[PDB]
Assembly symmetry: D2
Amino acid sequence: SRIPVVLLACGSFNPITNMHLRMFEVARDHLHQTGMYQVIQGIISPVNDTYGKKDLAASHHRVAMARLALQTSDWIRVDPWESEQAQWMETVKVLRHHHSKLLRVPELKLLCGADVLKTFQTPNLWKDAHIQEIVEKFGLVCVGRVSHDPKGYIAESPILRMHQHNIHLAKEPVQNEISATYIRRALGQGQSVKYLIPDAVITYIKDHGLYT
Amino acid sequence: SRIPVVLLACGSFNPITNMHLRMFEVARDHLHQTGMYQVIQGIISPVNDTYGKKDLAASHHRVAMARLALQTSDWIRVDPWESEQAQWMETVKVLRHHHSKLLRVPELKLLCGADVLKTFQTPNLWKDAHIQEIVEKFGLVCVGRVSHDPKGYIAESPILRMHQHNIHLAKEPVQNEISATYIRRALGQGQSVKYLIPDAVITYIKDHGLYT
Amino acid sequence: SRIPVVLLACGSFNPITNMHLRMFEVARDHLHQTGMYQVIQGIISPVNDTYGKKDLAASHHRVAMARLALQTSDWIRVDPWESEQAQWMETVKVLRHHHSKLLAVPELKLLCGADVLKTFQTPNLWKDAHIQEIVEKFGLVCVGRVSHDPKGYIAESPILRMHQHNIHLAKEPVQNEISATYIRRALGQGQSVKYLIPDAVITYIKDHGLYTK
Amino acid sequence: SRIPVVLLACGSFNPITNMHLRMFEVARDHLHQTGMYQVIQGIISPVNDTYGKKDLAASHHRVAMARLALQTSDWIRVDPWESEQAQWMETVKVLRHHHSKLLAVPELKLLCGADVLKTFQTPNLWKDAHIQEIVEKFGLVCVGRVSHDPKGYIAESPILRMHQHNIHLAKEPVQNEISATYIRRALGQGQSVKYLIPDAVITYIKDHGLYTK
Ligand SMILES: NC(=O)c1ccc[n+]([C@@H]2O[C@H](COP(=O)(O)O)[C@@H](O)[C@H]2O)c1
Ligand SMILES: NC(=O)c1ccc[n+]([C@@H]2O[C@H](COP(=O)(O)O)[C@@H](O)[C@H]2O)c1
Ligand SMILES: NC(=O)c1ccc[n+]([C@@H]2O[C@H](COP(=O)(O)O)[C@@H](O)[C@H]2O)c1
Ligand SMILES: NC(=O)c1ccc[n+]([C@@H]2O[C@H](COP(=O)(O)O)[C@@H](O)[C@H]2O)c1
């Protein structure tokens, strides 16, 4: 039988966009395609407000937009836990938390774009022990992104190359490179972002005067 | 004051996708950005079933999906006229028809991707007289597409370069290259196309067993 | 053992670019990776000056630029036969010509971008009989292009689908999407196209004053 | 008249690619087009071997490959000073070094991809003081990269926004998106990278057996 899988996406979702959503669909089809897994749930987990040097919309807003974006999904949901904690938390700790919840078994895997594998290379950004735990205790499902060569990132990482069994590379045949940075800039200039992010999210943004 | 403009998109819409929809939004912002026009209406006109060597879903279905896709739009509508004619019609004739309807004045402009300008170069595909009428009597609003250099197409076309005043090039800052061919193949393989085309269109496709 | 293969690319080469050259390399690696072919030669065949609606530099120059571009290739050569004819010739006839020239005979395959498969769908552009002969008697090696879905083009064409075993799809992960149209526009404006097309080609264009506004 | 400008690119160049070289050309044309600058030189400065978590070919080799790649450039040269130091050096210090070497003094600007602007946002990666000095005292010329929105990076950074006049954004319409990571993987698998990186660089890699699995 198939191994039940839950996919967790940790990010800013400032705001959530059609690309972020498409990432889950592609990842699920890829896992199902292997014949060994049954994706049963997707979880969007917006980062806490204390994170970064950037000016993120308040977490309750990012969580609300994600929920709106996901109303039409029958398998992906937003979980505010991470954003409700007092402070930012390294991603492995969010994985640990959700793994436990599953117990109160399906495998919990981190879902990210190929761009994330490249960030693993950034000095001091991710503790080696954490990278190892992500691919050894949990799993990593990576969706392609223009300009990134995931197979090379893996081959060149002493840690990743030793845990390839837990790394799933899903190819994105579609050229959908929507940048949330671009979304925010366009919104700020009064330009349309319709068809780039969900309609309900656009309405929410207008209603709450976000990204002005 | 601003010149009222109506944008007409002639295509297969087999099925209509988020890229096709995004094309209108980008074109409108670009025209408004110039300061000289006020886009008042967008029209999607699905091609007639007698067109091509391809197997297109029946026109009533393509028209229905476009209408569903456009329910959330307050300015773009589908007009079945072209698809309801007995036979295929060169595009200039569809422009003429809609121009007349406007009379029962706003300028009517053809909306297309940069890829269309390249098709103007195909031997025997578009009558020179027709290309001329499109850019001289009406107008052409072109939205960028990867791999295409619209400025070069114009510069190299004896006809286009003489009517640059009626050609508006709108740059697509977003990497959204969704191919309807890809959409059909994925649907045929049972893969998700969610977030690539409107939810209501996906439901319609399933309900009517299209693209199997 | 392996089936010997010669790759033929028919196109404007106005001018030849690093992307046109890259296609040969990607196609060769792909065929070798299947383990059943051995590519022994590549042929660049510039189209006749009588062809199409667009303006082309003289074939004399396009053949020259291809020759210069290929000086550092040990397996690809330019063949001016097609452009030396009195008039344009349908691609199937160029394939036939080069096949006869080969006459244990290596297989001759047409090398093209995935966008060519789409053009097969254009009314009146290619004779069905020709499309069939091209895929059946010669074969196609298609290199992917942003925005095109070759697999779908194949599936939606009865002719291509029936002979899909003779259509080899290669994937070049690198964007490239360098269009010769862009190259010509840049040149006309006095901008650099270095590292987009071969240094030797730029020298020829400059020396002979080509592609000026 | 025009302000003389020298462009400095700091990076791995592991190995240098046609895309890295193309960035210099695109950046020069952009600055010239503003009508107020005249680019007089480009400098490729390979990073020190002590840098980062990834494995780099020896700087001896990266400097060599850059020199070979640049033999056909009449304005870009490789400068090994940075890689010859005992240890890695923050980019601002390399800029300071090259500025002193210039000492009517031409302006020295850091040439980079738009993705570098994003990295400025990484906690602990660049000192705010350094980011400020880089944009204020030297300047940045950023060449666009698929997936990145430089204008947004600038607007969302107080430091960059305040000195945005010293950040020059150039647009290369051509995809390219050739990553050195891909180049290294292809080489390791014995695939061709011809027309993606300079012929002279491929010869050196082959002669010295670099980038093997
Ligand atoms: N060391 C870590 O655990 C680590 C480092 C960088 C980013 N992250 C997470 O991945 C996402 C990165 O977001 P940005 O790329 O916008 O900074 C966030 O969810 C962030 O919390 C975790
Ligand atoms: N000569 C003409 O008027 C002409 C030629 C080719 C396509 N078209 C139109 O433009 C669109 C092209 O569709 P395809 O590219 O799928 O063939 C259709 O609406 C078609 O009717 C018009
Ligand atoms: N029916 C045919 O044989 C046929 C049709 C269209 C293009 N072609 C060839 O394709 C190549 C490129 O043509 P384009 O520049 O029109 O895309 C040329 O060699 C041209 O001769 C052949
Ligand atoms: N704080 C700094 O000066 C700083 C930080 C990160 C990268 N860099 C430089 O950027 C270039 C490329 O670095 P990456 O390979 O890490 O992207 C190198 O020259 C590196 O030294 C400088």
